[PDB]
Design a protein around this ligand. Structure first.
Ligand SMILES: [Mg+2]
Lengths: 316, 311, 314, 315
C-alpha cells in the first residue's frame, strides 16, 4: 500500500521508516498540514497518516475520497480534528492509536515536576554560560510530601508508581477506584481533600464535560501556597486565567504544562520569565520507545484494513 | 554568642536566620570569602561559619585566633579547606555537618537524569520564547531499562528507591553491600558488569585514592553507546578528558555533573548539563544544615559533647 | 491575475498583501515548499512566487506548465534553484528581484559587528534573567581603528558610509574601484594591505570564480590577531575550514555570518568563540521587504500586460 | 605604594594589572564592597581604589584613616558615594577619572540600537541552537529616517557622527547649540518637535533637576508609534512606570537601557514580552576605555605620592 504522511516531523519520519521495515508500505512524507487544498497531494495513495493539527473536516475528507483515498490513520489518540460522521458517510475508515505508552507520559510529568522543583531549566541557562550562582534555585525535598494524582487510568497509576519511589504520600481522585492504585497504598479522596492536602498535583484524566475547567479559581483557592501543578493531560482541565491569577497571587508555586498543539489558545513568555512556569510542546510521548509503539500501531492498523482483518483501533 | 558567617548567599542567610529563632545567637553575615586578609572582620565574634571555598589554612586560623575566635563551623560535610592539625595546635574547635539529607541529593540526581533524558532544559529555552518545536528533544522510556548505582551509602540507596519506582532493573557496585539495598531487590555486581549492562549510571560514593578517576577511558570503553551518566558525587571520580572524548565519540549519550563548589566550579555541543553543587539545595536540607550548625555551636558554648567535632 | 506564493513566511505575506493594494492580484499563500508533488496546488494560478529553497528544477517546472502556470517570480536575487534552460524551453517566464536595499544589508552587517564587538547578544542572555555581570563582555572602541571593506558595489559603499560615521580609517578592495567611495575618504588598497592593516573586515561582493574562497588560510595568516570578520555576502567567499582553524588559533577575534539557506553546510563555535550566525536576515526590514514585494508584483504586472520586464531571467 | 582595590571585577583587575606594569605599585584586589566593616582590610595600604557602590561616608573614611590610608581613588567620574568634606577634614586626598571615552559610550548606544532594530539578540538565541526562522525579527532600514539626540556634549556629538553615517536626518535638543554638531548638519529643535519627528531617540545628557523624568507620559504621548529609544545616560532621565505603560500600549517599539550599578523582575518581564534590552553599565566597557581609566587612576596616585599637582583631585 501507499501512505501519505502529513505534518511530518523528523522523529515521525524516523520511527515510521524503522517500523515500516516489517511492513514494506510505500511511504510518502509531507512536512505540511493536510488541508482541503493539499489533499490532492495524496493522489495515488490508499491511505493518509495525520496528527492533531491536520484538517479532517468534511470538505477535506471529500477531497481525499475523490483522489481514491480509503483510509485515515491518526498517529495519535485524539480525533477531534476528524469529522467521523462525514467519514462514515463517505465510506472512509478512520483508525487511531488508542493510548500512548503510559510510562513515557508519566515519566515526562515527573521530569517536569523535578525540573521545576530544582529549577534545573534555570540552572542550565546559567551554567551554559559558566554562571554557577545558586540564588533563587532552592527547591524542596519530595520525600515525605503529599502528591495528588487526578485520574487513575494507566498513566496515573504509572505516575503513582514513580511518586511512591520518591517516598511521598499518595492521594488520588477518580470516580472509579483502580485496584492497581490500591496495591501501591494510594488513598482515594475527594477533590477538596486532594487540593488542600497536596504539595504536588498531577493531572492524568481525559477531558469530559464534568471536569472541563476542573482547576479554576475555587480549586486554587483551596490549594496550599506554593503548590506544584503539572498537567500532561488536556489544557482545558485548567482555567488559564485563574491559573495566571493564582500564580501572580503566589498560591501556585510552580506550574508545568505540556501544551497540546491545537490547544495553544505572549502569555507564555511572560509567565516563563516571571514565574516558575514551564511549557513543553506536547512532548509527553516523545521517547524512542513510545514513538516506536505509535508507528507500530499505525502501520499495523493499516495492515489490518488492507487485509480486511478486524482493527481494534477503528473509529469508523 | 556572636557568629560571623562568611561566603553568605541569600539562602544561607534565610535558613540560618529561621533556625536561629531557637538559639538567639547574634549573627553577622558577610557575603565575601574568609581569607587571611578578611579574617580580621571576625573581631568580636567567638565563632565563624564557613563553607567550601573559604580559606581555613594555617595563616587564616592564626589570624582568627588573634582576633578572639574560638570556634569554626563548617556548614557542610567536607573539610579539606581547613587545616585541622593547625586548628588543633592553635586550640580552635572545628565542627561540621556530617552528611546532607540523602533524599535531597538523590532527588537532584534523578532530576538531572530526567532533564537530560527528555531534554527539558532545551525545551524550556525554546518555549520561553514560544518555540514549540520538538525536533531534537526525543528521549527514552526509563521503565524496563537498567540503572547502575555506584556506591550504596544512604544517598545511593535513596537513589535506588526512586529508580525502583521507575520500574528499572537495579544494579549496584559497592565494596560493602548494604542490607537496605538488598531489600529493594538490588543486584550487586562488579564494575565491568555494571558498565556493560547499565543504561543509566549514577555515582553516590566518597572520593578515595582507589576510585580516583574511576570513570576513565577503559570504563567508558565498556559502557553501552548512548549511556547516560550522572555525577552528584565528587568531580574527580570522572576523568574529564576521557569523558569529553567519549562524548565526541558518542559513547556517552548524556552527562550530568553537579560540579563542586569550586572544582573548576560543553553544554552547547552535546547533551551535557552542569549544576553548581546544587544537590543539597532544598529548604529541608538547608534547614538541617543550619540546625546542625547552630546546635554544634551551642554544644561548644556550653561545653557539651559535640558528635560533629573534627577537632 | 492569480498568484500562488510558496514558502510563505508571515513577513512575506504582510508585505505582499500591503503592496498588492496597488495591484489587485488574487493572492494565494502556501507555507510549504514548491516541489514536484506540491506544484499541482498552483492549478488555477497563472503565476507562482518562490524563494531560495523552493524547487524549480525541470520536473517541477513541467508540472507547473501542465497545471497552467506561465510565470515564475523569485522574491529574491538568487536563481540557483531554477533550471532556466528548462524554463526557457518550456516557455515559462522567470522574473527576479535584481538586488536588495543596499542600506538594509549594510546596516545588518554593522549590527552584527557591534553585537559582536560589545557582546550584546551575550549581555541579553544574562540580563533577561537579571544577571548584570559584565565579565567576558569587554569590547573595543571603533573610533580610530581601521576598517576594510571588500567589494564597493552599492552595499559596500553603504557600509563605508556607516563606518565613516564611526570615525574609522577606511580601506577598500575592489577590482573596479568606485568614485562614490572616494568621497568618503576611502583608500583603495590591494588585499594583502587590507588584511594586514584592518581591525574589522566586512565582505560586500558577489561570489565569482576569482574570489571563491577568498578568505583562506593565507588570508587569515596575514590578518591581525583578534580581527573581526563579518560576512553578509555569500558563504563561499570564506573557506570554512580555514576560518574555524583561525578561530581556534585565535587569529580571528570574532566572526559573523549571515548564512544563506542553500549554503547551510554552528553550536560549538557559537558556544566557544565570539561567533554569530543569522539566518540570511540582511534584507529583513520593512522597507526592504516592501521593495522586494513592489518589484515582484510590478514584474508580474509587466508580464501580464506584455510589457518589457527588465528583471526577466528568461 | 600599596593599593587596595575594592569592588574588583575581572576586567578591573586585568587593566589595572596591565597598566601597573609601568608603575610597579603593589596591588591588592578585593571583590567585595568597601564598608565601615571591611575598611580594616586596607591596613598597610596607603591608597584605596573604589567604584560607584563602595561606601565612602564619614565613618568609613574614619576607619580608613585609622588604618593608615591617605589616598582614595575613584576609578569612575561619579563621586556621590564619597563624603568630600569629611575626607578634607580628615586630611585624605580624593582623586577621580574626569570622563569616559565618549566614542566608547556612543558606540555602545548604536550597538544597542541596531541589536534592537534587527533583533540580533533574539536571532542569536535561535541560531546558537540551529533555528534559522526569521519570524518576528523584521527591523527597519535606518537610512532616511530621523534621529533625535538629547544632549550634545562630547558623547552626543559622537553619536550624531555615527547617525550621520547611517544617512539619517539629525535633530537634537540641547539648551546650548554645539558648533561641532552644526557642522554635521544637525538641526536643533525643541523637545516637542524632537519627540514628534524622531524615529529613534538617544539620550546623552547629564541628570539635572530640570530633566529628571524627562521622558514621561507626556513625552511618550507625543512620540511616533514604534519609536526606538536608547538610554546610555542615567536611568532617572526616564520615568520607568510611564515607559512600561508606553511599551504595553505599543507607543515604544524598542527600548534599550544601560543600567547603572547604583541604580538597579521588571527586567525579566519586559525583556521577554517586548523588544527591550538591558545592559549592565556596559557603555565604557572597552579595552581602550578601561585602559584610560586605569592609566588615569594609577597616574593620579603617582602624582599624589610624589606631591605633584593632580588635575583630577577632588579633595
Ligand atoms: Mg603582563
Amino acid at each position: 500500500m501507499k501512505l501519505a504522511v502529513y505534518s511530518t516531523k523528523q522523529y515521525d519520519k524516523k520511527y515510521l521508516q524503522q517500523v515500516n521495515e516489517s511492513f514494506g508500505f510505500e511511504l510518502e512524507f509531507f512536512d505540511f498540514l493536510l488541508t482541503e487544498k493539499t489533499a490532492k497531494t495524496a493522489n495515488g495513495c490508499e491511505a493518509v497518516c495525520i496528527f492533531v493539527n491536520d484538517d479532517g473536516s468534511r470538505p477535506v475528507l471529500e477531497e481525499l475520497k475523490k483522489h481514491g483515498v480509503k483510509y485515515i490513520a491518526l498517529r495519535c489518540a485524539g480525533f477531534n480534528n476528524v469529522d467521523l460522521d462525514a467519514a462514515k458517510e463517505l465510506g472512509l475508515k478512520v483508525v487511531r492509536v488508542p493510548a500512548y505508552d503510559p510510562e513515557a507520559v508519566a515519566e515526562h510529568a515527573i521530569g517536569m515536576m523535578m525540573t521545576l522543583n530544582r529549577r534545573i531549566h534555570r540552572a542550565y541557562q546559567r551554567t551554559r554560560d559558566a554562571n554557577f550562582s545558586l540564588e533563587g534555585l532552592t527547591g524542596f525535598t519530595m520525600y515525605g510530601k503529599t502528591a495528588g494524582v487526578i485520574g487513575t487510568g494507566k498513566i496515573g497509576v504509572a505516575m503513582l508508581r514513580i511518586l511512591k519511589g520518591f517516598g511521598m504520600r499518595l492521594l488520588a481522585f477518580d470516580p472509579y477506584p483502580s485496584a492497581a492504585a490500591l496495591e501501591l497504598g494510594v488513598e482515594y479522596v475527594d477533590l477538596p481533600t486532594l487540593f488542600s492536602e497536596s504539595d504536588v498535583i498531577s493531572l492524568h484524566c481525559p477531558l469530559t464535560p464534568e471536569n472541563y475547567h476542573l482547576l479554576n479559581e475555587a480549586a486554587f483557592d483551596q490549594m496550599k501556597n506554593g503548590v506544584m501543578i503539572v498537567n500532561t493531560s488536556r489544557g482545558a482541565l485548567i482555567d488559564s486565567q485563574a491559573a495566571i491569577e493564582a500564580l501572580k497571587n503566589q498560591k501556585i508555586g510552580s506550574l508545568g504544562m505540556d501544551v497540546y498543539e491545537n490547544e495553544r489558545d505572549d502569555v507564555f513568555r511572560r509567565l516563563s520569565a516571571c514565574h516558575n512556569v514551564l511549557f513543553t510542546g506536547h512532548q509527553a510521548f516523545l521517547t524512542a520507545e513510545a514513538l516506536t509503539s505509535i508507528s507500530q500501531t499505525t502501520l499495523q492498523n493499516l495492515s489490518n484494513l488492507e487485509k480486511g482483518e478486524t482493527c481494534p483501533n477503528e473509529l469508523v
